[model samples]
Each structure stands twice: as structure tokens, then as C-alpha cells.
Target: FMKEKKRATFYLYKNIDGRKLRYLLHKLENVENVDIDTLRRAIEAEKKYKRSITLTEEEEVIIQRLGKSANLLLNCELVKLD
Candidate 1:
């Protein structure tokens, strides 16, 4: 579990939503808690990104995790995790 005393910081306008988000929080938690930047890079990078987006392996990891999180968040908001 993460510490509850302080606050979690995020990159401005980042599309964080899962393990990537958690990892990002950790990275911002302390200067040494790094690696989330790399994860974000993987997530935002794409082929033909200016017009269409493509998923790479690392991006898939983020997408799968966040997709799960979005579902869970919706479930929770709907009175379950609906």
C-alpha cells in the first residue's frame, strides 16, 4: 500500500489510469522512485501518431491495465467496482 500522509502528484494532462498511474505517483513520491517516465513514453509513443494511433507492446501493458481500471472505476461508481 502507498503512504497516506502526503499527496500524490501527476504529470500535467497525463492519461494515467492504472499501474502506470501508480508507478507515476511513486516516481513523484520521491526523486528516486523513477521509471514511470519511461512507461509514459511507451504509452504515448505511436506509429503514424499524428493521424492514427498504434499500440506497441509496452503500450499494450498500459492499455490493458488502465482498461481494467476504467471498468473497475465505473463499477465502483455504479455501486459495485459497477
Candidate 2:
């Protein structure tokens, strides 16, 4: 039970999207060393003063790929439902 619990916790952290959360988990692949919770708090605090954040070219490409995959998956589900 203890081992299983640890594994579950690790899995959850692994998929936490540290980058998107602004939490830096250094040495964790693609993860920076930012505090995820703090970042969320900061954003909420400045919600009224928010400005758009621009993505880099590489980031935009990644976003496009994600969008394509999501659309493809959604269409597949719709076809199945029909």
C-alpha cells in the first residue's frame, strides 16, 4: 500500500505540467524551478491587470500540434457517438 501510494504521488507530479503552472522542478525534464502554487496566486492577484503573454515561434508550433491532436481526438469521439 505504501509503495502504491508513493507511485501514485509521483505520477501525479510528473503530469502536473510544471511549465504551464510556472513551477520549476529543476532536473525534471523540461521543468523549470518556479513555484507553481505561487505563480497561480500571482496570476489571480493580478487578474484585473493582466496582459497577454506572447508565445515564441517554437512554442506556437507546439501549440498547433496540440490543437491538431485535440481536434482529431474530438472528431473521432463524435464519429463514435454518431
Candidate 3:
């Protein structure tokens, strides 16, 4: 079929503690136009909840920075097209 459905996914709750994820977030912070305060708070929320946090507007901003490569690396289901 020419059209395929693609869906986004959030990371597993437990993966939040991984050093890899931390590094990814660190890298994300370096990207231009990212909001550090919001990202930090989101990270904290994830750490506290120990689960995938909801994709609110603030979280969406961070997700855009994650980009496609980091999306796979961080397992951040931000965008998918098939």
C-alpha cells in the first residue's frame, strides 16, 4: 500500500534511569531553542513517576529536539511515518 500508518511511542518507565537516556537528554539540551527548565522538570517528573510521562505541550518541545536519530536512541516515540 502507498499509505502506511505510523504511530509514536513513549519510552518504557524503567528506561528513564539509564545513563544513555541521560546523555541523550544532555545532548538535547545543547540543541538551539530548547528550554532547559522545562526539560529538567520533565526529567524530574519521569524520575519521580518512574514511568512514561504524558506528552503535554512542554514535553512536545523536548521531543522535537530529540529528532529522529535520538528518538530511536532514547526510545522517544515522537513521530513515525510508514
Candidate 4:
């Protein structure tokens, strides 16, 4: 459909851990231009108990990098799932 649909997903939240983050980089591997290691570090630094810390506008830069690899307005939502 041309129109956007609101899709409910727990997928990413479920994978919100450092180990999974490394796995993700191994996959995405800068298939786009996301400074993968830095993001990977940021993710690793911020994770705990299978959860993640908060993000600010500063961190949104890294996320924008990921959006380049995928979709922006359509695909991702940056919320602290844990």
C-alpha cells in the first residue's frame, strides 16, 4: 500500500543488548554509512541487564546514520524499550 500503516513491533526491543548489537554490526557491517564501530561502542556502553540507557539529540546523530542504511520516517522508532 502507498499509505503508511502503524505496525506494532517488539522485535528490536527484544534484541536490545550488547551481544545482539555486535551481532547486528556483523550483519549490517556498514552496508550503509553508520560509523558502525562508534555506534556499536555507544550501544555497548549504554546497555545493562539486557536493557539500554537513555538517548538524547546528540545520540540521534548515530541513529540517523543507521537510517541511511535502512528507512527513516518509515522503519524505525527510537524509544527506550526497557
Best TM-score among the predictions, by candidate number? 3
Where does candidate 2 have its weakest 10-residue lDDT segment? Answer: 5-14
User: Local error of candidate 2 at 74, Å?
Assistant: 17
lDDT of 2: 0.29
lDDT of 2 by residue, 1-82 (tens): 1222111011111222324322221112242333555444433432222112244454444334545332222222222223
TM-score of 1: 0.22
* Candidate 3 similarity to native, TM-score: 0.29
Across 18-60, the per-residue lDDT of candidate 1 in tens digits comes to: 5544443223322332255544443454322111123445444
lDDT of 3 by residue, 38-70 (tens): 444444444222323334454456666666644
Instruction: By TM-score, rank the candidates, best first.
Output: 3, 4, 2, 1
TM-score, per-candidate, Cα-based = 0.22, 0.23, 0.29, 0.24
- Candidate 3 weakest ten by summed lDDT: 73-82
Residue-level error in angstroms, candidate 4, position 28: 0.4
Ranking by lDDT: 3, 4, 1, 2
- List candidate 3 stretches off by more than 4 Å: 1-8, 11-14, 17-27, 31-51, 75-82
At residue 49, candidate 1 shows an lDDT of 16
Better of 2 and 3 by lDDT: 3
- Tell me the lDDT of model 2 at 65: 52
- Taking every candidate in turn, the Cα RMSD to the unseen true structure, in Å, is 16.3, 18.4, 12.2, 12.0
Better candidate number, 3 or 4, judged by TM-score: 3
- Which run of 10 residues does model 4 get worst, by summed lDDT? 73-82
